[PDB]
């Protein structure tokens, strides 16, 4: 029953090939609802969920204005960060920013976040009090001093505790059929010999939402963490997710092994067995 709204922004420099590529996406939980791509023809923030389509012209105009302003800031940032780190024009570099807010089952604010990364590593992040900064290295200390002097945290806190939470509530209401649903996983295990003496056991979960799920293997009740191959949870493309976990076991020992599935859609966690 808990929920989140998050916006993700990626800007990538391209040496001697024009302006940086900029992409923004926004999500409620594991459902995308808006996008912007600097390389696309429209130059507009665009809907990517049926329930956001009803927002009027002022919404789309305002969101487009904001996202273009983010794009321009990250364009400057790529230059600034090359200065901070004494880097040349020879290579491409990446800035990422993500921010948003979490609410619990009662839709009341839990926490807010705002994090920035340069070349795949933490650069600077707002702390949990929304009043102070964690800077990951010396160059990010420079940003921290500048952002402290400019009172950026107070502005972000007002957004995260106010606007973010208010609009997440509106979206949860307008997209209730999609967003406030829970699809329990449809589960099964498969068995395939990999030789005359071993078998792969694979535990499947299909057709679930939200994406959060735990799949684990036990052998006589003991967790087989180091021997389990667990794949990344993946989109089926219809709004649901899939995940599997596998172990390779000696043939004849299948009955010692159980797969265990936890999801918020299940009335109880499931244990699947070979007997």
């Amino acid at each position: 029953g808990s929920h989140s709204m998050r916006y993700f922004f990626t800007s990538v420099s391209r040496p001697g090939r024009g302006e940086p590529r900029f992409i923004a996406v926004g999500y409620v939980d594991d459902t995308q609802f808006v996008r912007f791509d600097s390389d696309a023809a429209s130059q507009r923030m665009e809907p990517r969920a049926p329930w956001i389509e009803q927002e009027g012209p002022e919404y789309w105009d305002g969101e487009t204005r904001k996202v273009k302003a983010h794009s321009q800031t990250h364009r400057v940032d790529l230059g600034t960060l090359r200065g901070y780190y004494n880097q040349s024009e020879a290579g491409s570099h990446t800035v990422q920013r993500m921010y948003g807010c979490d609410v619990g089952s009662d839709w009341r604010f839990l926490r807010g976040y705002h994090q920035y990364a340069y070349d795949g590593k933490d650069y600077i992040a707002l702390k949990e009090d929304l009043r102070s900064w964690t800077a990951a290295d010396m160059a990010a200390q420079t940003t921290k001093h500048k952002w402290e002097a400019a009172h950026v945290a107070e502005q972000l806190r007002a957004y995260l505790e106010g606007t973010c939470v208010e609009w997440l509530r509106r979206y949860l209401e307008n997209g209730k059929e999609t967003l406030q649903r829970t699809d329990a996983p449809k589960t099964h295990m498969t068995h395939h010999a990999v030789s005359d003496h071993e078998a792969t056991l694979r535990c499947w979960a299909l057709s679930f939402y939200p994406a959060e799920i735990t799949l684990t293997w036990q052998r006589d009740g003991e967790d087989q963490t180091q021997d389990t191959e667990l794949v990344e949870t993946r989109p089926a493309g219809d709004g649901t997710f899939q995940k599997w976990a596998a172990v390779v076991v000696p043939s004849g020992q299948e009955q010692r092994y159980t797969c265990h599935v936890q999801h918020e859609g299940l009335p109880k966690p499931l244990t699947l067995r070979w007997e």
Binding site: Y7, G62, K66, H70, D77, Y116, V152, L156, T163, C164
Partner: peptide, 10 residues
């Protein structure tokens, strides 16, 4: 809605 304030250059 995205942030309309607090997004400043590093």
């Amino acid at each position: 809605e995205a942030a309309g304030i607090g997004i400043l250059t590093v």
